[PDB]
């Protein structure tokens, strides 16, 4: 199975540059051309560029001349793109995508790198739980107070799926984010299992398991 | 640079329905033409190539038409996954540019919310703020007031709320409203009460819990 494995998160500072890395597998990474694409948040796509692996041959957007440079490494298999000179209009989500020859089309897609452009400090999120003070029983994690996006939050290491909602951040006017992570359980199969949140905050390396009890 | 225009954003449509999502071209593609499909996690699938070809494993209640300026992906029955952005991409010159995509709002059958309140830990409190959580489940349509009630005093200008993206199963909306006060204006009050209106409620329905 073809996969197009993107970097972390990354926050960095207005004139720095920034690379990212687009690890491939499932196909020898040499047959085929890799593009970039940009995604400004609310926004379209745009194609930054393409490099043929094979012999490092480049195409870029006229609009990214200045700011892009695509490079590979035949050996890892995994191709790089440099943006430089980054101001906030370079905050976006980065895809990698695989070029096929049918009559061409992107079709494989990285799950895309997230670049925030700031003068801020990274900062980790606190995690509290939410518990109640019926059919079905309610609980959470509130993720309180992080910069940059994105955390990801899990429950009870991945084994809880359903009834879980993780809502989208919302900027609060601290210029910080918080979100709440919450699952609910028919009451029936609430005390059967324990309830832990995992949040995982990347660009300030946090990693918290919290864990909600459940009231006696 | 050929502009690729998808002059409709945001599309509504039934569960069942045929749905056409199109795009314009500035100047003629020769039928070099792609849609893409985007979930609301950000991924992105390959749809169709070339005006009309399925990509291997994409359901045939997709096809592709046109040619010269204009293009259209056609749905041929909605499903509940069918919800996401689609993008139209032409690579017929250097720079390859992409339509300004069209978002889809599931129409479903009204489920009001069920309604949760979760007061703040202490773990939050000994740090000066109070988070006050209320959280809305698996309703449709996205219309919903929800309004904090502090002693049976409406709260105004003191919450903020977020909404998730359409669910692929069973096409709801869930929102939270978090209500933030300093630990001291917490700690002056007795009941927390948040109260929600929606079209699948024939009254309000108001969740609470007292402090103390």
């Known amino acids: 199975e073809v996969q197009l494995q993107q970097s972390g998160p990354d926050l960095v500072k207005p004139g720095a540059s920034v690379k990212i890395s687009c690890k491939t597998s499932?196909?020898?990474?040499?047959?085929?051309?890799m593009h970039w694409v940009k995604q400004s948040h609310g926004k379209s796509l745009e194609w930054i560029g393409g490099?043929?692996?094979?012999?490092?041959?480049?195409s870029y957007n006229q609009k990214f001349k200045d700011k892009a440079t695509m490079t590979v490494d035949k050996s890892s298999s995994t191709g790089y793109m440099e943006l430089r000179s980054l101001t906030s209009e370079d905050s976006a989500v980065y895809y990698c995508?695989?070029?096929?020859?049918?009559?061409?089309?992107?079709?494989?897609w990285g799950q895309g790198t997230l670049v925030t452009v700031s003068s801020a400090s990274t900062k980790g999120p606190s995690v509290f739980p939410l518990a109640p003070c019926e059919s079905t029983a309610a609980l959470g994690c509130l993720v309180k107070d992080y910069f940059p996006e994105p955390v990801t939050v899990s429950w009870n290491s991945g084994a809880l799926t359903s009834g879980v909602h993780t809502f989208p951040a919302v900027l609060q006017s601290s210029g910080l984010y918080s979100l709440s992570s919450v699952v609910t359980v028919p009451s029936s199969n609430f005390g059967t299992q324990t309830y832990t949140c995992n949040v995982d905050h990347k660009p300030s390396n946090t990693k918290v398991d919290k864990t909600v009890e459940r009231k006696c | 640079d050929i502009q690729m225009t998808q002059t409709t954003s945001s599309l509504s449509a039934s569960l069942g329905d045929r749905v056409t999502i199109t795009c314009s071209a500035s100047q003629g593609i020769n039928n070099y033409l792609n849609w893409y499909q985007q979930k609301p996690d950000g991924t992105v699938k390959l749809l169709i190539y070339y005006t009309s070809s399925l990509h291997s494993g994409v359901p045939s209640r997709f096809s592709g038409s046109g040619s010269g300026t204009d293009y259209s992906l056609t749905i041929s029955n909605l499903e509940p996954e069918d919800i996401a952005t689609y993008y139209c991409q032409q690579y017929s010159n250097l720079p390859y540019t992409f339509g300004g995509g069209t978002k889809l709002e599931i129409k479903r059958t009204v489920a009001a919310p069920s309604v949760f309140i979760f007061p703040p830990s202490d773990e939050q409190l000994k740090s000066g703020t109070a988070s006050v959580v209320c959280l809305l489940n698996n309703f449709y349509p996205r219309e919903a007031k929800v309004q904090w009630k502090v002693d049976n005093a409406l709260q105004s200008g003191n919450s903020q709320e977020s909404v998730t993206e359409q669910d692929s199963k069973d096409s709801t909306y869930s929102l939270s409203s978090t209500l933030t006060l300093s630990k001291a204006d917490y700690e002056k009050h007795k009941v927390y009460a948040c109260e929600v209106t929606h079209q699948g409620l024939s009254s309000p329905v108001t969740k609470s819990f007292n402090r103390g």
């Open positions: 499932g196909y020898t990474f040499t047959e085929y051309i």
């Open positions: 490099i043929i692996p094979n012999n490092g041959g480049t």
């Open positions: 995508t695989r070029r096929e020859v049918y009559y061409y089309a992107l079709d494989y």
